Symmetry: C4
Subunit: 359 residues, 4 copies
């Protein structure tokens, strides 16, 4: 399939996954060079991108002897919504760069593993189509605010009509990071932005760079849904968001694509969780690839753990069944760790105390 | 020699050893690719495998000036049993992957250097044959528990009949780690499991994933032998094992094959030893390759130091005499360190205070 | 253009800059080998050169959520002089090695972005020509003291006549560092030193190796301009300079060209700033290449941030417009960071608290 | 020149030295493979060899602003003996491996720069010839003790007759380290041991492995010379040596050739110096190659700084004039650092306070 001379994947098949990191070298044979650069890249020298991986080495999981547990269970809840896994899809623009079906194959994959999907404002496919593809699989919607509230109120209405269970407000992207891969490729989006086209019938730069605490109160009061602030990297900011009416905190550095020279996401998670003190659920992302990565995030104060790039690569390699493969593989790796660590349930993982030796 | 199309080594000869690490590149020319992958591999990205080596850099041995010692002695005891060396063979499944004689050549090698051998439940050769090959060389037996106690009680009987002096209960392998090399090779064991075949006349997944402290009391009461819990990586768990009736603690992370993202074995040894406070002997393994590695383990709270992979490589390269070469080489390296450090006996090494500079 | 068989650049054009580090590999295709070695090199094994880059990893910038700022402003002042950017040109000898126009194209570049230029005593072009090229763009003059005060007083007079707004006294170069690249190239300056030729009508070794605190008082009293001591790497020395009559402190290790085995410039900045306690403005250089580098310097106690090598490379690649490109690129990168960090103005960046996690 | 089929260097010429590290790659083109391996090698995996270099990164030299010093002076004294440099020749066996003249060209080199030479028991050339070649240049003699005191007393007599000013007792080599290069090369010394041949007319294994504190008292009482214990790596051992009658402490790990897994020599220097509290002079070696290395050793508690390998390489490349070149080059690098650091004399370097940032 082509769209303005860009080759999109049409694959639909389970994929043999060695691990999630190795999906990147595999996806690069099939995703056009400019789109691939767009997905894999981070900002400046990609130091924060690299540290997002390294930082998991900063804590260690104790093997547990004589636990008396078998057959660990991945099931959990958020805002009373049941999930089969604590692993979820992070909001990710322009999945049409990977596959002709784009976000619809993502939604089907997530529905297949009973996991949570976050839709992006900057989707290749509209809110209604993506929610329709997912059936009754729970979805969140991620809003990029306009200076224009007529636009904000229209997308929130479309989201409410689609039965989304929460709004993610993304606040760490008021401007694009300096992304060298997009500059080298002279990359321009070859396909359209469904939700923007639709507003237009009744990029980062109408968006709003100026975002205040009153804007969280306002979205909460309009939607009457739980609102989650995404991009938090400090305790003070988690407190400030809860004070303004947030129902959750999404600890993220946008996969190292924004403020390069900021810390690895993992390294600020426990501090934020200590400040939040279980007042609201916490979602965590940026650098998650192995079962041990997920275990450590849950043990450090996360309730849910989101991936971005590994899923987009799986979407290119296998469409809906590709996405499914990604979540099944990470679930497998996480089950192994939970057994060896003596954590029966996801609540046991959160109560687990990590070692802090310096390597 | 062949067995279901798998080439086994028939070599029997002393081997020139530069060092134990270099045995891996040498063994790979002769062990079939899938078996080699099975032996060399660790779990996930093998970070814990790598750290098992690195962690020895975390403490340093003081050269001692004017010690007034010569001709250091490697002799020691466990449970009143005399050994010529504190270096022992860790329990290791399926030595038939390296050599037609498998565990029998291992047993002969260990008998030749007056060292202790641990037999594995998942041996290529039965308990009785392995004990027969070793003559009067002391051996331990390593049990993988079944949900079925009729099976546990049969292997413990076979072990008692073979004059084993202790039981090792291995508790860190209730499920296989995620081992990428076995997945890449599509590796299936080409040869049988002697002790299982024998039960069947009157893999990790009858075994028992649920292991409790009462199961240590039970094995001790049945066998009336000392029981050693293997896979301990925390002080709390060493205490919990002693409380349940363990006669020893085997500090091990299974050579980095299980819970990847757990600490290097060496890094938790001194803490465990401080908690144990010489109430019971301690065995230590995972990453041991040089004389200084052994010295540091003994100085940090070990009574015995076990190897796995370096011996299996030596078995492939030289059978019984190959195994012997491995233990003679490590003994040489350890004698040098003991002389330069001013430790006359193995008890002097345990009383040695290591430096803790950060490199 | 040639001068004693040395090829000089004549280019005049905007340059596409991926980033400032990548200018070095680009400049090397066009600057003759010996001149290139002179510019890129540091002293001994260049460990201090390398650490000047690494040390920026020692602190991290917090992304700020819900800042309520847009359109950050780069404007600032020193000694009441308005600048469009806190990024300035460090004093740098012999720009004729890069371009036929030398320091004149530098001056024009800096005037184009409304930034501050420091002239060097060891210029290819005289004080008067360089100041003439810059028009009304503010410039400082960097003095290398002679044992002969008749020479000092002549250059300070030439500087005063050119309307320079301050004197930089450089005290970290009483002897050349051991620079291996100059030894390998057998490098001899192929072009003359304008300000020295001019004195001679009415290298490091008349200069003065013995520099005292009375020499700062003396230059201040003669010129009646603010005097800034450059090369400070300790709090005690910043205090000693202020005590002797310095109006500013220039934290610098001369781009790792002098005392190899001394600390990275960044690593002593906050200590010096704590001791100085805003008594005088602070200029910072050595290893600055990205927006995050500049943000971190300002946040750690700098008022201005100077570059050397990246500008010289830009001068070779594009003359006046090349230099301009360098400052526009670093300004862009700095604007992005300021937006994501929630710092509206340059005073907000100085009030920003950096994270101190260990990587 | 040949000796039992081994090619020896006959060169006599000043050598162009980029730096001391680069002498190793240059010497390897001319020294036969087995001899080269003997000189360059360390023990086990050479980790301690590597750290001897790395550890100099653990402290940093402050550039000093406004010092008011010029023309730094390298002159010093030990036991009232004047030297032109604090850089000295460490005792080094078998210099005949590098050059037909062996230790005689070393002695002439050291006499040319007014530096101190240590002779080795295991010299290619006798005590009397080496002392004769050096003229009135001060020399020390390094004793390897025999179980036989008739041998000890004969070499000490030969040393006293040669006007040596002190005895070094080397105590860190009671057995050879495990040196892999000598094992790979099947290396056997192709030339004789002059001082042993001479005893025989009226390797490490008659020597004495058992060395006590009474043996220091005994050598001091017999020779009536100052006795220096070499190989000290702990404060306790420096105290124990002073208690037994040592007149100096030689902090050394034998260039990383002995106890691999022991600390870098530099890392224990300040502790030893704090314990010694200037009761006796301290000599320091193992990993010294740059001016900054020497400055840091002096600043950390050394009185003299010895080299081994860099001199042996220089002896191969240029004989007497080669050795001279090595000491002149390191003197140059040290003069530069002393000027930039504001240390006029060698006593000023010892009073210098190093920075301790972690890199
Ligand atoms: C190609 C791509 C598009 C993205 N689009 C969005 C987006 O529209 N909204 C958003 O809030 N975050 C976006 N992100 C950030 C992700 O939500 C998430 O924080 C990140 O991808 C997690 O890091 P990982 O890719 O290493 O797992 C995007 C990330 C990628 C790689
Ligand atoms: C090929 C192989 C088979 C093993 N089989 C067993 C086993 O059957 N039982 C057990 O308790 N440990 C087993 N182990 C773990 C070892 O007992 C030991 O902890 C490990 O090999 C030590 O690390 P090293 O190989 O670096 O020395 C095995 C290890 C290897 C490499
Ligand atoms: C080629 C070159 C010439 C220099 N000339 C001078 C000079 O004449 N006076 C001076 O005070 N500093 C001089 N410096 C040091 C710079 O002022 C500045 O401290 C340094 O270049 C900053 O490090 P950077 O090049 O990594 O940004 C020079 C540096 C270079 C690379
Ligand atoms: C080839 C060689 C021979 C040596 N011979 C002796 C010796 O006979 N006696 C001794 O006390 N130390 C000996 N050493 C150790 C040196 O005295 C010194 O501690 C070491 O070479 C310093 O480290 P460096 O080579 O990195 O500078 C020798 C070292 C080398 C490399």
């Amino acid at each position: 399939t082509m769209i303005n001379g860009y080759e999109q994947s049409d694959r639909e098949e389970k994929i043999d996954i060695l691990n999630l990191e190795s999906l990147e070298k595999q996806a690069e044979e099939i995703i056009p060079a400019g789109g691939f650069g767009y997905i894999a890249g981070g900002s400046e020298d990609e130091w924060t991108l690299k540290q997002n991986r390294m930082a998991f080495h900063h804590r260690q999981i104790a093997p547990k002897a004589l636990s008396g547990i078998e057959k660990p269970e991945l099931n959990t809840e958020i805002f009373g919504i049941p999930l089969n896994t604590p692993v979820m899809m992070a909001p990710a623009a322009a999945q049409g760069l990977a596959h002709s079906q784009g976000e619809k194959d993502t939604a089907r994959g997530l529905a297949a593993v009973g996991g949570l999907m976050a839709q992006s404002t900057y989707s290749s496919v509209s809110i209604a189509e993506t929610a329709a593809a997912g059936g009754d699989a729970p979805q969140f919607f991620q809003l990029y605010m306009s200076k224009d509230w007529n636009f904000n109120e229209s997308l929130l209405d479309e989201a409410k009509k689609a039965n989304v269970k929460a709004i993610i407000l993304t606040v760490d992207a008021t401007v694009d990071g300096y992304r060298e891969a997009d500059i080298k490729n002279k990359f321009t989006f070859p396909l359209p932005m469904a939700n923007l086209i639709k507003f237009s019938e009744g990029i980062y730069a109408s968006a709003a760079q100026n975002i205040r605490p009153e804007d969280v109160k306002r979205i909460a009061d309009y939607t009457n849904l739980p609102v989650i602030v995404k991009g938090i990297q400090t305790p003070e900011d988690a407190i400030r968001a809860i004070d303004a009416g947030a129902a959750g905190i999404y600890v993220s550095n946008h996969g190292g694509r924004q403020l390069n020279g900021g810390p690895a996401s993992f390294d600020v998670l426990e501090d934020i969780a200590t400040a939040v003190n279980k007042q609201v659920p916490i979602i965590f992302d940026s650098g998650v690839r192995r079962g041990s990565d997920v275990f450590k995030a849950l043990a450090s104060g996360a309730d849910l753990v989101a991936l971005g790039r590994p899923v987009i690569y799986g979407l290119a390699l296998g469409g809906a069944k590709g996405v499914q493969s990604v979540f099944e593989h990470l679930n497998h790796e996480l089950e192994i760790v939970m057994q060896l660590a003596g954590t029966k349930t996801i609540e046991d993982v959160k109560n687990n105390s990590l070692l802090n030796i310096k390597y």
